[PDB]
Amino acid sequence: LKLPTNLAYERSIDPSDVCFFVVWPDDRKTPLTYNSRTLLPHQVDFCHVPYGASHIECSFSVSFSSELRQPYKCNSSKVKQTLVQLVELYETKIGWTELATRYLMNICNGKWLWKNTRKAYCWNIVLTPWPWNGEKVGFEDIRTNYTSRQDFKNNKNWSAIVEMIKTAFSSTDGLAIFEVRATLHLPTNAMVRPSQVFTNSRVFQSTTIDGERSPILGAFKTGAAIATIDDWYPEATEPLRVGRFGVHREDVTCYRHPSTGKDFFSILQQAEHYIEVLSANKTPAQETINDMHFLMANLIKGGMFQHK
Amino acid sequence: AYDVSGQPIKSATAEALAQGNPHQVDFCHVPYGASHIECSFSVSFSSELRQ
Amino acid sequence: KWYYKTITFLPELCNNESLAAKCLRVLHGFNYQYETRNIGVSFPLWCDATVGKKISFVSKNKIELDLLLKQHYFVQMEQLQYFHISNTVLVPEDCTYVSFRRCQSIDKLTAAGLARKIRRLEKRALSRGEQFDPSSFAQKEHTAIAHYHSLGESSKQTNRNFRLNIRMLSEQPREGNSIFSSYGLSNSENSFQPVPLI
Amino acid sequence: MFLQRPKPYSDESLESFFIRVANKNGYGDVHRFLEATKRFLQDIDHNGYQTFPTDITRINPYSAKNSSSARTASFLKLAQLTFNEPPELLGLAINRTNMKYSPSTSAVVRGAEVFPRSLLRTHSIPCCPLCLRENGYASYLWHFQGYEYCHSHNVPLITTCSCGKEFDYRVSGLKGICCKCKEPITLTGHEAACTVSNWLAGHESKPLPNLPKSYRWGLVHWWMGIKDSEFDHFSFVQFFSNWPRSFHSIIEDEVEFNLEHAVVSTSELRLKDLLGRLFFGSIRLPERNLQHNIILGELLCYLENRLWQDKGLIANLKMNALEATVMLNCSLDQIASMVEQRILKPNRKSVTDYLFHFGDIFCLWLAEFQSDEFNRSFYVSRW
Amino acid sequence: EHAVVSTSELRLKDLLGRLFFGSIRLPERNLQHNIILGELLCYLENRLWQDKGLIANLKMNALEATVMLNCSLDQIASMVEQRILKPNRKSKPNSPLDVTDYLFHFGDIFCLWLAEFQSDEFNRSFYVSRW
Ligand SMILES: [Zn+2]
């Protein structure tokens, strides 16, 4: 399967910025503020929880959508068919439940709160899905409960949420919006770690709430956190952020390097093979459904699979 | 990482594909407390198609 | 009557702040060994980037200067030729006096210091029966601070890691009062005192 | 957290240890305990934060690639931060090692004993169901493709039951209940292999030598090197039944056949041709410690005695420089420095060309490279 | 006490230099016999993380990793391109291997000896089960 000159996918998981708020024992919310120290112009910033702050809310909104069904561009329809059929046959044979679960787990346990949970007493993820009929779905004390996939499945509203997500991923035009709020508890005067801005010098990426500036975890940082599902790779140890070549950031070197045949554009070169491997009435191997899981997640991330 | 005709690049090592390159994008998003987004414009239909 | 004895750090690879902090540690241990307080310090190369290769000990007393400078740690890093000890010299021509002061107001700017300040304030105000709201004392958004250097330090009686945020401010040799802080710095509450920057 | 360890055994697989520490302190299933320790390594800052394993099949550091360092750090921390008294948790871990076995094959060490990678049971690890029920732990030896009978019960290891069409304690739980049907799992040239398996554990067996339990697996891998596959215990035990006789016959038979069937004449005959497979297939087992590497010992003894028998046909065998760097542990750099210093005799003047004999190199190893254990005196005072 | 450098840059060559690199190969590093390397390694392991990782965060150079655990600096290059090692500083372009600059932490090299390099007798289990 050749790689066309115009191929692009629009992303399905669309998160928003993660805005922080501080809740005082009077139960009113004031946005976080961060010192910006400068020595005499490196301007290192410092965001710590205020003194009397009872706890800290972290709100954001993530939208799952069925933008992965049709490629946003294919200058050659011959490849558009083999990808829309790829998605259809994936969904039919191995349903969306695995990708949906591995996304909603990152949503529902604090994983978008990247480092802000190292020293936290307890954080509760309250979740308000949009096409919803019940109340809010709330997970609490995520290091005491909801520690593994099973504990998630044990919550009474979990199946409905995953069903909504796989619907949004299934329907021709479905979507599913979640407003997530994390009532996080930190020790007195604890460090919050919003996303640094790209430029020692630590300068925070920030927004303005109530006219005054507050620190945020970027929408792209959060999208990176929700997409740490890629545990299917050679000698897989811990999940990666889904990428065309599974990259790591702490230890720079990149797994799924296209030398191995487990990058993206290599297992896309075999999409025709995967079509017939799924089309058989018999179930496919575990490794090949791992390859196709990574392929589907890489479509959900969307992007540009071109060669100009 | 690949050149045309599907051949890996010997210089794109597993440390070269891992280097994070930066981009710059303009980012617009609803403020936090904002209720909703108004969007206003005016469209005028006319008979400039007769002649 | 300013005697001074400088010390220059030899090793071409050395973190001067650490060595200066250890010199001040041992100076402090001295000033608490004998209750003398009349040995001040100076940094004849107080560059922008770092404290320089030198730390000088200045005193009106002559016996205490060389009594200190032959302490155990100094003779030890002398035989290992890390340090270079000079002799007890006077200097009346280097009128280029400065004041190395422990700028304590820098520790009230770190978040864990603002926490201390607010906790103390409310502990006071509630004793005064006043109403204290810790939700108003918001952190300053931009606190640009003057250039300074920091020497980490610890207390033997209670283990903690504070820092002498030492800062050099120019001055004129207004009077020899002959009193320094235990860390050999000039502090405003005690008799402020300049020192000859050799 | 804080845990208590159970009755630590010496020969107990790491996974077995984690099972019997999970089901001892507070956890129902060991998987929960793995997530608990991962949360622990979250709480105290660490590097096993990311790569600490939660599936029990891949706990031993040889499973993680480019994370074995972190996993051993993790085991070190666990061993001195999470128990009432510190356990020997790291010694039970099967981790990689740098040393190889003779033909281009890597090795994995556990405790003080290094096994070849060639026989590791990457999957479908057997068990002694009886020993499971009595002792309550899984011995490590079950992981290797030599241990085919329980050295304590002389029973073949149950790899697949009737209820469970394939079984392993790493999912069972150190108890006799199959995967599908809950019931006792206990079902069932026997002695020709029982002695071998008992000798594989640190023990003695009448025909097999008293080598260190790192060199026993070396013997086994070498035997599979001769017998092109299919390690059978009977031929092994009978081969060590007449030990100095059988191997001497083998090297004679291999050496004589090579000399007739050689296609190029005598003077240019090389030693990878004659004595090609035995010599280099025994030179590095656990290591060339001639006291323990009994095979290389006997081979070198036999070669030394017959060094000059037929025109020194053995002694004047051309070996390339790179084969001298194997014959005696050295660098092509260092043998180059030796020959330009005129230590060796590059028969033709002027680097991977065959320019040196065996005899001049054997005496060279005797003179300038005889190590502490790679030593001549270990084999000369043998049978 | 007399370290002319801070702790975050304190190396192993100076702190504990003569003892370690003076006992690493008395005749050869068999930890059952090389009793002094055995006890030094036991002491260091038992105090790897004592004071916010004092011993653990000790700077080590490639030419010291090659002697703490037998391998050639080219094999170390192969270990650090495979990211089995943790080169705390980034050499962005094309990996120019500098074998002299203090780049690894001792703790993370002690652990790398504990797996990937625990050879036949250069083995941890020889010293831990001692006095
Ligand atoms: Zn048994």
Side-chain angles (χ1 to χ4, degrees), chain A residues 50-84:
Chain A
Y51 163 71
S54 69
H55 67 261
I56 179 170
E57 291 206 1
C58 314
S59 68
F60 90 117
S61 90
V62 50
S63 298
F64 300 74
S65 297
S66 65
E67 292 210 353
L68 86 176
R69 311 306 255 55
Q70 316 75 352
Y72 181 88
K73 258 153 71 178
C74 284
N75 58 306
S76 178
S77 77
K78 197 261 173 182
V79 78
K80 169 187 180 306
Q81 283 97 60
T82 184
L83 271 73
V84 63

Side-chain angles (χ1 to χ4, degrees), chain D residues 128 130-131 142 150 152-153:
Chain D
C128 186
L130 284 79
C131 182
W142 306 347
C150 166
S152 66
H153 311 147

Side-chain angles (χ1 to χ4, degrees), chain D residues 13-278:
Chain D
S13 199
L14 177 55
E15 300 90 309
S16 193
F17 178 73
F18 278 169
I19 300 280
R20 52 191 278 277
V21 303
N23 76 344
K24 171 176 198 322
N25 306 271
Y27 310 79
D29 185 18
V30 65
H31 196 81
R32 200 65 50 79
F33 173 67
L34 293 200
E35 275 100 11
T37 74
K38 190 170 180 196
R39 293 186 305 105
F40 179 85
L41 297 192
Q42 306 270 108
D43 291 8
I44 180 166
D45 266 333
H46 205 44
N47 304 126
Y49 200 91
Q50 316 178 115
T51 82
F52 196 89
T54 40
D55 39 16
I56 304 92
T57 79
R58 292 177 52 196
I59 305 169
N60 315 330
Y62 80 88
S63 310
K65 301 281 185 179
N66 75 91
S67 157
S68 44
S69 173
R71 195 155 312 175
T72 55
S74 303
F75 294 162
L76 268 182
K77 293 292 276 298
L78 266 289
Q80 52 202 42
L81 266 77
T82 68
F83 293 98
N84 44 6
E85 49 258 8
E88 182 62 27
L89 190 149
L90 183 49
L92 320 175
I94 299 168
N95 37 8
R96 306 190 193 80
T97 186
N98 185 28
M99 54 196 288
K100 311 289 185 64
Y101 274 47
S102 61
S104 162
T105 177
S106 66
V108 300
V109 63
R110 173 201 181 281
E113 155 190 38
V114 56
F115 312 93
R117 183 84 69 106
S118 67
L119 49 95
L120 191 52
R121 277 161 173 151
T122 60
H123 62 89
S124 76
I125 59 174
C127 73
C128 186
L130 284 79
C131 182
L132 263 181
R133 299 188 299 101
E134 293 105 16
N135 289 320
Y137 70 85
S139 176
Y140 71 87
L141 290 86
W142 306 347
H143 284 243
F144 308 100
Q145 277 196 40
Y147 202 85
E148 296 301 323
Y149 284 74
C150 166
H151 79 274
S152 66
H153 311 147
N154 316 116
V155 171
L157 278 75
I158 296 302
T159 181
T160 61
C161 192
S162 59
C163 324
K165 310 321 292 174
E166 65 265 15
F167 177 93
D168 56 63
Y169 59 88
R170 303 183 293 175
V171 190
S172 174
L174 300 180
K175 282 305 290 287
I177 59 170
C178 298
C179 66
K180 65 180 63 53
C181 97
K182 319 315 176 177
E183 86 185 7
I185 188 173
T186 311
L187 275 78
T188 301
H190 290 248
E191 291 75 3
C194 280
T195 51
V196 154
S197 70
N198 161 256
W199 168 74
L200 272 174
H203 269 298
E204 59 86 20
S205 71
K206 298 322 285 162
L208 307 168
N210 295 107
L211 304 195
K213 72 191 304 193
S214 167
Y215 283 85
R216 323 205 164 182
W217 305 97
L219 296 191
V220 168
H221 179 256
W222 178 74
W223 200 225
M224 308 196 328
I226 307 187
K227 267 68 179 168
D228 52 4
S229 166
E230 185 263 334
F231 175 76
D232 66 79
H233 315 259
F234 180 80
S235 163
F236 196 70
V237 295
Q238 60 82 40
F239 165 76
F240 278 93
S241 297
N242 44 1
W243 159 224
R245 166 70 261 144
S246 62
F247 183 50
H248 270 250
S249 66
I250 284 301
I251 56 175
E252 276 157 339
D253 301 2
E254 191 272 18
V255 55
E256 51 94 340
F257 169 75
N258 287 197
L259 69 82
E260 287 106 12
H261 303 64
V263 308
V264 72
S265 73
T266 79
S267 313
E268 66 277 15
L269 178 60
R270 314 159 311 176
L271 195 142
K272 187 62 178 71
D273 298 332
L274 184 64
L275 292 171
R277 62 185 185 96
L278 275 299

Side-chain angles (χ1 to χ4, degrees), chain C residues 34 46 52 65 92 109 117 141 145-146 159 172 195:
Chain C
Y34 323 94
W46 183 276
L65 199 66
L109 301 191
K117 167 199 301 181
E141 185 66 43
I145 64 187
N159 286 148
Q172 274 308 285
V195 164

Side-chain angles (χ1 to χ4, degrees), chain A residues 7-28:
Chain A
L7 166 57
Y9 265 78
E10 189 178 1
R11 66 158 181 268
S12 299
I13 319 300
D14 174 78
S16 67
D17 287 335
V18 175
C19 60
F20 294 113
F21 281 81
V22 159
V23 182
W24 313 87
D26 75 337
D27 200 340
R28 84 183 188 278

